[PDB]
Design a protein around this motif. Structure first.
Motif, PDB file in Angstrom:
ATOM      1  N   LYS A   1       0.824  -1.211   0.000  1.00 31.76           N
ATOM      2  CA  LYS A   1       0.000   0.000   0.000  1.00 31.76           C
ATOM      3  C   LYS A   1       0.858   1.261   0.000  1.00 31.76           C
ATOM      4  O   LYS A   1       0.463   2.290  -0.554  1.00 31.76           O
ATOM      5  N   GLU A   2       2.023   1.179   0.642  1.00 33.78           N
ATOM      6  CA  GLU A   2       2.956   2.296   0.702  1.00 33.78           C
ATOM      7  C   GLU A   2       3.472   2.630  -0.691  1.00 33.78           C
ATOM      8  O   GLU A   2       3.486   3.785  -1.098  1.00 33.78           O
ATOM      9  N   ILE A   3       3.895   1.600  -1.413  1.00 29.79           N
ATOM     10  CA  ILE A   3       4.314   1.738  -2.798  1.00 29.79           C
ATOM     11  C   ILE A   3       3.219   2.404  -3.612  1.00 29.79           C
ATOM     12  O   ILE A   3       3.493   3.220  -4.486  1.00 29.79           O
ATOM     13  N   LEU A   4       1.976   2.055  -3.303  1.00 30.37           N
ATOM     14  CA  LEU A   4       0.824   2.564  -4.039  1.00 30.37           C
ATOM     15  C   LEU A   4       0.603   4.061  -3.833  1.00 30.37           C
ATOM     16  O   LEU A   4       0.645   4.838  -4.787  1.00 30.37           O
ATOM     17  N   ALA A   5       0.359   4.447  -2.583  1.00 28.25           N
ATOM     18  CA  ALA A   5       0.002   5.821  -2.247  1.00 28.25           C
ATOM     19  C   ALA A   5       1.057   6.776  -2.765  1.00 28.25           C
ATOM     20  O   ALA A   5       0.745   7.791  -3.385  1.00 28.25           O
ATOM     21  N   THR A   6       2.313   6.423  -2.515  1.00 26.95           N
ATOM     22  CA  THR A   6       3.455   7.183  -3.001  1.00 26.95           C
ATOM     23  C   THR A   6       3.527   7.239  -4.528  1.00 26.95           C
ATOM     24  O   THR A   6       3.957   8.240  -5.093  1.00 26.95           O
ATOM     25  N   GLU A   7       3.116   6.162  -5.191  1.00 24.15           N
ATOM     26  CA  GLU A   7       3.121   6.106  -6.653  1.00 24.15           C
ATOM     27  C   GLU A   7       1.991   6.960  -7.178  1.00 24.15           C
ATOM     28  O   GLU A   7       2.067   7.551  -8.258  1.00 24.15           O
ATOM     29  N   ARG A   8       0.933   7.013  -6.390  1.00 19.66           N
ATOM     30  CA  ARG A   8      -0.197   7.846  -6.710  1.00 19.66           C
ATOM     31  C   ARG A   8       0.235   9.300  -6.705  1.00 19.66           C
ATOM     32  O   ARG A   8      -0.068  10.041  -7.628  1.00 19.66           O
ATOM     33  N   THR A   9       1.009   9.679  -5.701  1.00 15.85           N
ATOM     34  CA  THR A   9       1.529  11.030  -5.601  1.00 15.85           C
ATOM     35  C   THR A   9       2.578  11.304  -6.673  1.00 15.85           C
ATOM     36  O   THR A   9       2.624  12.384  -7.248  1.00 15.85           O
ATOM     37  N   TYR A  10       3.392  10.303  -6.972  1.00 16.95           N
ATOM     38  CA  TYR A  10       4.399  10.430  -8.016  1.00 16.95           C
ATOM     39  C   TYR A  10       3.787  10.754  -9.371  1.00 16.95           C
ATOM     40  O   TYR A  10       4.285  11.615 -10.098  1.00 16.95           O
ATOM     41  N   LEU A  11       2.708  10.059  -9.712  1.00 16.14           N
ATOM     42  CA  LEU A  11       2.056  10.276 -10.999  1.00 16.14           C
ATOM     43  C   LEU A  11       1.423  11.656 -11.080  1.00 16.14           C
ATOM     44  O   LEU A  11       1.392  12.266 -12.144  1.00 16.14           O
ATOM     45  N   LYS A  12       0.941  12.158  -9.951  1.00 14.76           N
ATOM     46  CA  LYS A  12       0.361  13.485  -9.914  1.00 14.76           C
ATOM     47  C   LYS A  12       1.460  14.535  -9.960  1.00 14.76           C
ATOM     48  O   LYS A  12       1.269  15.620 -10.517  1.00 14.76           O
ATOM     49  N   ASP A  13       2.608  14.202  -9.374  1.00 11.80           N
ATOM     50  CA  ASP A  13       3.786  15.055  -9.444  1.00 11.80           C
ATOM     51  C   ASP A  13       4.177  15.234 -10.905  1.00 11.80           C
ATOM     52  O   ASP A  13       4.294  16.356 -11.400  1.00 11.80           O
ATOM     53  N   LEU A  14       4.358  14.121 -11.602  1.00  8.34           N
ATOM     54  CA  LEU A  14       4.696  14.160 -13.019  1.00  8.34           C
ATOM     55  C   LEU A  14       3.688  14.949 -13.860  1.00  8.34           C
ATOM     56  O   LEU A  14       4.054  15.586 -14.850  1.00  8.34           O
ATOM     57  N   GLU A  15       2.421  14.907 -13.455  1.00 12.84           N
ATOM     58  CA  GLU A  15       1.347  15.555 -14.198  1.00 12.84           C
ATOM     59  C   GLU A  15       1.428  17.060 -14.094  1.00 12.84           C
ATOM     60  O   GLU A  15       0.747  17.762 -14.828  1.00 12.84           O
ATOM     61  N   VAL A  16       2.256  17.558 -13.180  1.00  7.60           N
ATOM     62  CA  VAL A  16       2.421  19.004 -13.029  1.00  7.60           C
ATOM     63  C   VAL A  16       3.175  19.562 -14.232  1.00  7.60           C
ATOM     64  O   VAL A  16       3.059  20.742 -14.574  1.00  7.60           O
ATOM     65  N   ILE A  17       3.925  18.684 -14.885  1.00  7.85           N
ATOM     66  CA  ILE A  17       4.748  19.058 -16.023  1.00  7.85           C
ATOM     67  C   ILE A  17       4.121  18.585 -17.323  1.00  7.85           C
ATOM     68  O   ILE A  17       3.920  19.366 -18.248  1.00  7.85           O
ATOM     69  N   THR A  18       3.807  17.295 -17.374  1.00  2.10           N
ATOM     70  CA  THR A  18       3.342  16.647 -18.600  1.00  2.10           C
ATOM     71  C   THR A  18       1.907  17.008 -18.983  1.00  2.10           C
ATOM     72  O   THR A  18       1.494  16.828 -20.128  1.00  2.10           O
ATOM     73  N   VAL A  19       1.149  17.515 -18.024  1.00  2.00           N
ATOM     74  CA  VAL A  19      -0.205  17.954 -18.296  1.00  2.00           C
ATOM     75  C   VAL A  19      -0.291  19.473 -18.179  1.00  2.00           C
ATOM     76  O   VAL A  19      -0.433  20.184 -19.180  1.00  2.00           O
ATOM     77  N   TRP A  20      -0.174  19.958 -16.948  1.00  3.13           N
ATOM     78  CA  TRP A  20      -0.369  21.369 -16.631  1.00  3.13           C
ATOM     79  C   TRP A  20       0.651  22.362 -17.196  1.00  3.13           C
ATOM     80  O   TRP A  20       0.267  23.364 -17.800  1.00  3.13           O
ATOM     81  N   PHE A  21       1.940  22.112 -16.966  1.00  2.00           N
ATOM     82  CA  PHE A  21       2.989  23.003 -17.462  1.00  2.00           C
ATOM     83  C   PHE A  21       3.030  22.996 -18.982  1.00  2.00           C
ATOM     84  O   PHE A  21       3.324  24.010 -19.606  1.00  2.00           O
ATOM     85  N   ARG A  22       2.731  21.841 -19.564  1.00  3.03           N
ATOM     86  CA  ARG A  22       2.779  21.677 -21.003  1.00  3.03           C
ATOM     87  C   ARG A  22       1.843  22.649 -21.688  1.00  3.03           C
ATOM     88  O   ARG A  22       2.267  23.424 -22.548  1.00  3.03           O
ATOM     89  N   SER A  23       0.572  22.598 -21.297  1.00  2.00           N
ATOM     90  CA  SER A  23      -0.459  23.432 -21.903  1.00  2.00           C
ATOM     91  C   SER A  23      -0.085  24.910 -21.882  1.00  2.00           C
ATOM     92  O   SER A  23      -0.200  25.605 -22.889  1.00  2.00           O
ATOM     93  N   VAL A  24       0.379  25.371 -20.729  1.00  2.00           N
ATOM     94  CA  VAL A  24       0.766  26.761 -20.528  1.00  2.00           C
ATOM     95  C   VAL A  24       1.847  27.188 -21.516  1.00  2.00           C
ATOM     96  O   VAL A  24       1.849  28.314 -22.008  1.00  2.00           O
ATOM     97  N   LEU A  25       2.754  26.272 -21.823  1.00  3.64           N
ATOM     98  CA  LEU A  25       3.816  26.536 -22.784  1.00  3.64           C
ATOM     99  C   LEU A  25       3.276  26.606 -24.202  1.00  3.64           C
ATOM    100  O   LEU A  25       3.830  27.309 -25.040  1.00  3.64           O
TER     101      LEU A  25
END
Length: 436
Positions: free
Chosen positions: A10-34
């Motif tokens: 479960k630890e691997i999971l929750a943290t991976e959940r946060t990791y994917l959202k971390d990555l989405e700050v760039i690959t989704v959100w930052f991308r569009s703005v650019l």
């Protein structure tokens, strides 16, 4: 026993959940703005995204495989069995992840190019600026470019932790050691790249934060510690900011009404100074910094704080045996009279953790993220912005005086948190202690 192995999953999971959202700050959100603003030259967009996108793909698939297994876990009696096991999933991805190392080696090059692009291009700097203002950007933008390689470590750390409460006889024992060995050699290859990046990141951040200072980022300067101390003046003990790098000591100028508390006043080279502990100034916890041609006396908030700043100065002056010209962590130090070392960062990073827990007016369930000495509060595991935040420098984890509750204490501020389980209880107050 058997429960301990499940909570790691479960630890691997929750943290991976946060990791994917971390990555989405760039690959989704930052991308569009650019794209909407097109202030970024296509070369840098390729360099940025050719190296984050492919990584993001793998991980999105990986989170799936995980959370599924985690569902089949807590299942018939003639199958489970292979439902309560994850070494197989890990072993696969690990030996499959090593194929992405080439991508990672360029993160030091992406953090590098963004910086120059930001300084030489005026439109991108504006864009970058506003984007770090958005609620989606809960940490500095640079901090995210780091997390990919840092995540690699966290698998090594977690996989390590699995082989701890495992012994010959378990189905998932032979796989994990193969998996661990697979990730250990993945991190090994990039261990140099990692440290190089972690440091470039800190220098590249400070370079922005601090006003006046230029050319601070250099292939040499490593960061020793930053923090707040009281400089001795003709008007009295006055709070100031100190940033100790491997080759100089940066300190903050006189506080003016409405101006920044983080304007650099001057640096004091480490060649060739002496620090000497102070008389009845002992109670004031002050020491004196004789530099090659300037001399300062300075008081620490406490005694240990003094010994830290001194031990770190002295050991740094010996080790040194383009010219610098004239609510984050730096801010939490100003408001609590403390400091943070290069050693502390690597202890708040290795102690990252996500999870669900409750918070007593009236017990309130939130999903909490612990990175950068700070707790971030979400209502759902799926939101894209934190509802609240709470930095933890100078917070102490103790039991009060429900079931399985720990408390955070700081002066008059008292918070209470509950975890569902008891293992996961001993783990939360563990990491908070290891980032303090």
């Amino acid at each position: 026993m058997e429960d301990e192995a499940y909570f790691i999953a479960k630890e691997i999971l929750a943290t991976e959940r946060t990791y994917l959202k971390d990555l989405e700050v760039i690959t989704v959100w930052f991308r569009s703005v650019l794209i909407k603003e097109e202030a970024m030259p296509a070369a840098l967009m390729a360099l940025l995204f050719s190296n984050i996108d492919p990584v993001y793909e793998f991980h999105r698939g990986f989170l799936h495989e995980v959370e599924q297994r985690l569902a089949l876990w807590e299942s018939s009696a003639h199958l489970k069995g292979d439902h309560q096991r994850i070494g197989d999933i890990l072993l696969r991805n690990m030996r499959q992840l090593k194929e992405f190392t080439s991508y990672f080696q360029r993160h030091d090059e992406v953090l590098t190019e963004l910086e120059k692009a930001t300084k030489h291009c005026k439109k991108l700097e504006a864009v970058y600026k506003e984007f770090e203002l958005q609620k989606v950007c809960y940490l500095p933008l640079n901090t995210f470019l780091l997390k990919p390689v840092q995540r690699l470590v966290h698998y090594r750390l977690l996989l390590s932790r699995l082989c701890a409460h495992y012994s010959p006889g378990h189905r998932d024992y032979a796989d994990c050691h193969e998996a661990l060995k697979a990730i250990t050699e993945v991190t090994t290859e990039l261990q140099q790249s990692l440290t190089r990046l972690e440091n470039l990141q800190k220098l590249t951040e400070l370079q922005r934060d601090l006003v006046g200072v230029e050319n601070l980022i250099a292939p040499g300067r490593e960061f020793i510690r930053e923090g707040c101390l009281h400089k001795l003046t003709k008007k009295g003990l006055q709070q100031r900011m100190f940033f100790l790098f491997s080759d100089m000591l940066l300190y903050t100028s006189k506080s003016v009404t409405g101006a920044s508390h983080f304007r650099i006043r001057g640096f004091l080279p480490l060649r060739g100074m002496l620090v000497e502990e102070s008389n009845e100034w002992s109670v004031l916890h002050c020491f004196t910094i004789y530099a090659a041609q300037k001399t300062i006396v300075v008081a620490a908030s406490t005694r240990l704080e003094k010994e830290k700043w001194m031990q770190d100065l002295n050991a740094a002056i010996q080790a040194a045996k383009p010219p610098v010209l004239l609510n984050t962590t730096m801010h939490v130090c100003w408001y609590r009279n403390t400091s943070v070392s290069r050693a502390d960062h690597s202890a708040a990073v290795e102690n990252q953790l996500s999870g669900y827990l409750l918070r007593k007016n009236g017990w309130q369930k939130l999903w909490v993220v612990f990175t950068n000495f700070c707790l971030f509060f979400y209502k759902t595991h799926q939101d894209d912005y934190p509802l609240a935040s709470l930095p933890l420098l100078g917070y102490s984890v103790s039991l009060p005086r429900k079931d399985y509750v720990f408390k955070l204490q700081f002066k008059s501020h008292v918070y209470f948190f509950r975890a569902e389980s008891k293992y996961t209880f001993e783990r939360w107050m563990d990491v908070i202690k290891r980032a303090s």
